[PDB]
Every structure is written in structure tokens, then in C-alpha cells.
Amino acid sequence: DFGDHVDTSIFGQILEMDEGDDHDFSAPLVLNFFEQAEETFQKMETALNNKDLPELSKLGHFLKGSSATLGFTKIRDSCQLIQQYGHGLNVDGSSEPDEGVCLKKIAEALASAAVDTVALHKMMREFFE
Amino acid sequence: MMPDFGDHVDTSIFGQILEMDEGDDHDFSAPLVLNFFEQAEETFQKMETALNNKDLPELSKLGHFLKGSSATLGFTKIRDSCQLIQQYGHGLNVDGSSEPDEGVCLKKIAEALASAAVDTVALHKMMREFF
């Protein structure tokens, strides 16, 4: 019971596809997702010290897609914000004129994304082994 | 008997941690290090929560803590991110300059935290590859 961190329905089907206790299809898939997500952060980091919103918006759109594939709705929702805010848009729905407010909320959301990553990285280690 | 952790680890510090073992067991270090990422992973989950509630003191304490624990291993890249957490968890700039603004601190904390959260993962791998 990953609980909060993994859409119970989505991942089931990723594990169903396996044949046997090899963990033959799912473990390739999630291995790469973590290696992939770790780079998308190094970038998001560089881009926040860049103080982009465009670049950040885009990184956030992406890792939403790739994470929504595995039902990692924790990391998804964070990236959802990275996109929203990166696109100068607030949580209530109003536009966010202030560039700083975005960068702050982004950094805040990126950190909180980078966390559940390390959290799920452990949860997945314990699960697969 | 030679890892090029490079930026991630203080060779000096980790040297003495690995000297305090007995052979291929890594009997002292591998346990202590193994727990670190158990501890670090916990610390972060709190930091996030704390940060989500705009609690500059608690963040500060968390940093102060994890700094020491990390500092002891020679995990410089992760130590220094914490140094910025705790120091800003006071309202203090990188230099020592005053930082009156909360939103300014929170951002640089999240920035630094995020960056800790990465090297953790990065090193976690590097270590597994070492062990």
C-alpha cells in the first residue's frame, strides 16, 4: 500500500504485464523513470537559477506525462504546478503577474516533487527486492 | 579500493569511516551509511511538510540536524544544502547578510532542499555501486 504515492489502479497493469518473479517489464520501466526524473530535476534546478518560467513550465509538463504513465500521482501533481506556474498561472485559477511568486511556488513545488521521488525511490527498492 | 565520488563526498572524512571497518564486510560503515539514507529520507519528508506550512524555525532545526549527521560522513554537497536551510531557517543570507523577507528565504530553501534531495538520490546510487 504505497497509499498516497502511487495510483493503485495504474501501476497494477504495469505489474500485470510481468511474467513471473523476474520483475521483467515493470522494473526496467521504473528504473528508467527514476534515472529520467533525476535529470529533469538537475535541469529544473539549472532553469530556476536560470530563473526561466518557460523552460520550467515545459520540464513540468513533461515529467507529468512520464510519471502519469506509472501512476506516480505524487510526482505528477507537483509537476502539474511546475507547468501551471511556469505558465504564469495560479492555483486558484487567476494569472500570476509576479514572476517571483511563480519562481518561489515552483522551487517549493520542485523540492516537494524531488522529495516524493526519493520517498518512492525507497518504497520501490523495498518492494522489488 | 578507489572510488571517484568526486564532488559528492569528502575523501578525507569518509576515509576514516571506512578505516573503522574490518575487511570486505565494510562492517562498520555500510550499516552507518545505510541508515543515513533512512534518516535523510525521513528528514526531507518533514522539511517538505514544514515548508508546506511556512515554518522557518523547524526547517532551521531540521537543517541544523541533518547538516551534522551528513557532515560526519563527508557528504559535502548534501551538508551544504542543509547549511542554507538552517541558516535561512533563521532569516540569514548566504554571506551572513540579514534576510528580512520570508518568501525570499522559502524560495532559496526549496531551491537548496530540492538540490539536497537530488544529491541524496545520486549518492544513494554511487554508494550502492560502491557497495
- Is B110 within 8 Å of chain A by CB? yes
In a domain, A46, yes or no: no
User: Taking the C-alpha atoms of A48, A92, B48 and B76 in order, what is their torsion angle to the nearest 10 degrees?
Assistant: 0
The DSSP result for A107-129, as a single string, is HHHHHHHHHHHHHHHHHHHHHH-
**Residue keyed to cell 523552460:** A55
The cell numbers describing A25, all together, are: 517489464
Rounded CA-CA distance B45/A34 in Å is 18
**Residue keyed to cell 530553501:** B109
The cell numbers describing A83, all together, are: 507547468
Nearest CB partner across the interface for B48, out of A38, A115, A122 = A115
> Side chain identity at B32, as an amino acid letter?
L
Angle between helices A26-50 and A8-16 (to 10 degrees): 130
Rounded CA-CA distance A4/A13 in Å is 18
- Is A49 within 8 Å of chain B by CB? yes
In a domain, A124, yes or no: yes
Q: Which residue of B has its CA nearest to A120?
A: B41
User: Taking the C-alpha atoms of A83, A89, A90 and A95 in order, what is their torsion angle to the nearest 10 degrees?
Assistant: 180
3-class DSSP state of A35: helix
Give this entry's resolution in angstroms. Answer: 3.4
In a domain, B71, yes or no: yes
> Taken in order B100, A53, A113, B121, is the CA torsion positive or negative?
negative
Rounded CA-CA distance B81/A40 in Å is 19
Q: What angle do CA B50, B77, B120 make, to 5 degrees?
A: 60
Angle between helices A26-50 and A99-128 (to 10 degrees): 160
Q: What is the CATH number of the domain that holds A105?
A: 1.20.120.160
Rounded CA-CA distance B78/B123 in Å is 9
Way the structure was solved: X-ray
In a domain, B1, yes or no: no
Distances in Å between the Cα of A24 and the Cα atoms of A16, A18, A102, A108 are 11, 6, 41, 36
In chain A, the number of structural domains is 1
Cβ–Cβ < 8 Å for A53, A88: yes
**Contacts for B85 with CB less than 8 Å, ≥ 6 apart:** B47, B59, B60, B62, B63, B66, B67, B109, B112, B113, B116
Q: What is the length of chain A?
A: 129
Distances in Å between the Cα of B73 and the Cα atoms of A90, B18, B98, B124, B127 are 41, 10, 30, 13, 12
In a domain, B59, yes or no: yes
Rounded CA-CA distance B60/B90 in Å is 6
**Contacts for B58 with CB less than 8 Å, ≥ 6 apart:** B46, B50, B89
CB contact under 8 A, B121 and A118: yes
Rounded CA-CA distance A70/A117 in Å is 13
Rounded CA-CA distance B36/B131 in Å is 15
**Residue keyed to cell 528508467:** A32
CB contact under 8 A, B114 and A119: no
Q: What angle do CA B103, A87, A55 make, to 5 degrees?
A: 90
Within 8 A of A5 by CB-CB distance, chain B residues are none
> Side chain identity at A120, as an amino acid letter?
L
In degrees rounded to 5, what are phi and psi of residue B10? -75, 115
**Residue keyed to cell 529520507:** B41
Cβ–Cβ < 8 Å for A62, A90: no
For residue A62, how many other CB atoms are within 10 A of its CB?
A: 17
**Residue keyed to cell 498561472:** A89
DSSP character at residue B24: G
Rounded CA-CA distance B112/A1 in Å is 31
Nearest alpha carbon to residue A121 among A27, A19, A34, A18: A34
Cβ–Cβ < 8 Å for A14, A74: no
Nearest alpha carbon to residue B10 among B67, B76, B80: B76
Continuous H helices in chain B: 11-19, 29-52, 56-71, 76-88, 102-130
In a domain, B5, yes or no: no
Distance from CA of A66 to the nearest CA of B (A): 18
Domain that holds residue B63: 11-17+26-130
In a domain, B3, yes or no: no
Phi-psi region of B57 (alpha: psi -120 to 50; beta: other; left: phi over 0): alpha
3-class DSSP state of A95: strand
Nearest alpha carbon to residue A84 among A75, A73, A99, A96: A96
In a domain, B2, yes or no: no
Rounded CA-CA distance B39/B49 in Å is 16
Nearest alpha carbon to residue A62 among A42, A35, A36, A88: A36
Q: What angle do CA A97, B107, A48 make, to 5 degrees?
A: 75
